[PDB]
């Protein structure tokens, strides 16, 4: 529709977008934008090929038209700067139009592509035998109401864990000469991990970051990352999240180990852990590193719009068992062994030395530690179960997704993943940090912060 | 959001919209529009009250923002004219902003109103005990795909009937000295009616007319028309449609009557209808008039977005039986009587005068008439059945509509009307005209049009 066809004006915008990129003076930059503005306004007068059947006042026609409202405003912001002779930054403002261009060309000049498949020229983004279509970034199995529901749940829980574990780090360093002692300082490193994990989980809430993390440049979803031309954003969120949570679950095994061995103090001033502290840092930081490095090697980092992060085994449930179920499983056997070895010792001390737990100081932090070890084991047990549910059921959910994608070209989805199971899972993973941070919710912490403010007068 | 709240900037636009209406000079008109533009742009920066939960890039946020793109463009068209000192037409361009204002205030500053009920200050538009909400114009029981499907069906069929019956009128007047003879000229008046009916049915396809016909000024649907402040558009479409189709069904009874009585010619040059022609025009034009005048009296004209016209008994199935089922029913008993009286005569002539139907001229148009009478009776029989299905089932469809409206404040509709039954109905009502127009699809018509072009050389 209009003077020129929709595809013609879109090709005009594309050609002039590339001429700005390779332009020398403001005269040619200004020339492109003023011919681009004319094109956008003429393309706006048009009717897209699969919208002949739609009303002119329809939300589709109004949104197609709106794309050119966004584009003309952006053209004007670049046109203002090009008029200001500021070539450099005018080419930078013109680089913003590529976002609108890629989204609206995809939406309205879809071609052979029908939702959830989207128009993309990147052959690595193409789905099955379908030439030129890729699976849309936004998870087509979940509604906008459910996406927004998960985002709220993660924001609320992420922010709580974030601030709780941040305070516990602050309380520890505020009294580091005193608090940097084992087995107490284990909880500091556990809290460091959940804090770093939270930052990874809350990254999606930063203006437009969720798309930058989970979508490819072409609007298709992130798959088999690390991959060429794409940004590091996906893998950075993966590394932050996966390393931080895998390190934190190792420090949990360390906690259970420390609780079991600190029974050897016998209330007495002996330090059973003395000299063992070196291995604690070697195991907790080397073990998740080796795993992370291996995931980047196999390139099995995939993104999710509902989760908002990049993770291992989102598309391949096989890699999810080997890199999530297997470590969490193994942390439960080893951590579970030391807790059983801990209770065995407690009833052995109870028989051999009745009244040795007589009131305090050392004996008080001992049971607080054993409560934390059991409380954190319980949460690891819920995540393991949630991850297992996903693992043993993902094959059918993937077959239901193929059967829907392929049909969409009534047409509905048989089964899909459980957001309740993922929220139950998220609660346990955030709850391990919330519960672990309350290690510092002592009368002594009030003293630490009283002396901290006195020294800040 | 922004400098001022959404409601504040919308109130600013409203106040300045009224100041333009009561303005004296261009300076104050120009002053309002430039303060209106600032408001629209600031209101565009805002987030509507029930859209805090929605993404900023969401289609809702993009459409809310788009309303101000439409408004600013309209403001500029009025601002261009006000700058041109053309106060008169600037106030006329400013009058266009009332359309956008009413639609977007309704959509995004909905208040206590939840779809399908819409925000309206007109108390005559308010639904049940709900204070300030009215039932939306667009039929909430039918999807945008089904609305667009009915519109296509009516356009295709309306245009065919329209052109077929237009040609038959043209063929008749092109040879009026010859063709203005009974019983043939009855088909001309039958075709006149279907043509006028088609124009009534095709009015909805004129740029934005469908809304002007079926919606109240406040965006609620047309009900109990004729009613104060509203335009005549609804009632004009009703009168055109109802009178034209009710007159056409009376001319059908006249046809059946004429076929029965023209048996009294006996091939012979006697004109049985001679002098009876006066009553034919008295009955066919007075009878639908009396009915139309009575519908406007009881004020039972309601509009429909899926049908696109205004009609009797859309909301009250009772009035639909009395003004549609009752006349169509009665036209079937009287028209049916004369067809049975016609066949009775044919077999009486066959017995009393074997070989009187020996070949032509008068005997040829006689059977063509009896085929038309039976062919048109068949179609009246389908519409009667379709109207009856609607009548005896509308009470539950209305209870399902209340139960949905009231719930919407999952939530779905139990049962709704049948578009197949209405399309079957439409086919028969359009088909009566299509079949009736083929009266003129004779070898003789080619002669008429050959002599018409010769006289146009
Ligand atoms: C990723 C991911 N994505 N989603 C997820 C979220 C929303 C929608 C769709 C999917 C979920 C629920 C996860 C869970 N990851 N695990 C949780 C267990 N943790 C180890 C661990 C950490 C602390 C305590 C105990 C165990 C590893 C990461
Ligand atoms: C109005 C209306 N609205 N709708 C309708 C259309 C779409 C959706 C929802 C509803 C329908 C199907 C109608 C039907 N009206 N009758 C048809 C019968 N005719 C008398 C008649 C005329 C010629 C031949 C035989 C009979 C009176 C008007
Ligand atoms: C991720 C890296 C985390 C750095 C931890 C540094 C640390 O505390 O390690 C102690 C060292 O092994 C001495 O015993
Ligand atoms: C132990 C169970 C505690 C886990 C509670 C989290 C479940 C939840 O919050 O439910 C989400 C919602 O009801 C479903 O979409
Ligand atoms: C609607 C009005 C249709 C006007 C018809 C005029 C007409 O032909 O009436 C003849 C008159 O009764 C002489 O016999
Ligand atoms: C005699 C029957 C002929 C009537 C044919 C009209 C029915 C029709 O066209 O069907 C519409 C569609 O299939 C359903 O939504
Ligand atoms: Zn002992
Ligand atoms: Zn817009
Ligand atoms: Zn006889």
mmCIF file of C-alpha atoms and ligand atoms in Angstrom, chain A residues 266 349 352-353, ligand 7:
data_model
loop_
_atom_site.group_PDB
_atom_site.id
_atom_site.type_symbol
_atom_site.label_atom_id
_atom_site.label_comp_id
_atom_site.label_asym_id
_atom_site.label_seq_id
_atom_site.Cartn_x
_atom_site.Cartn_y
_atom_site.Cartn_z
ATOM 1 C CA UNK A 266 34.669 -32.161 72.870
ATOM 2 C CA UNK A 349 29.364 -38.502 73.073
ATOM 3 C CA UNK A 352 30.542 -42.048 76.591
ATOM 4 C CA UNK A 353 30.276 -38.574 78.222
HETATM 5 ZN ZN1 LIG C 7 34.729 -40.163 74.512
#
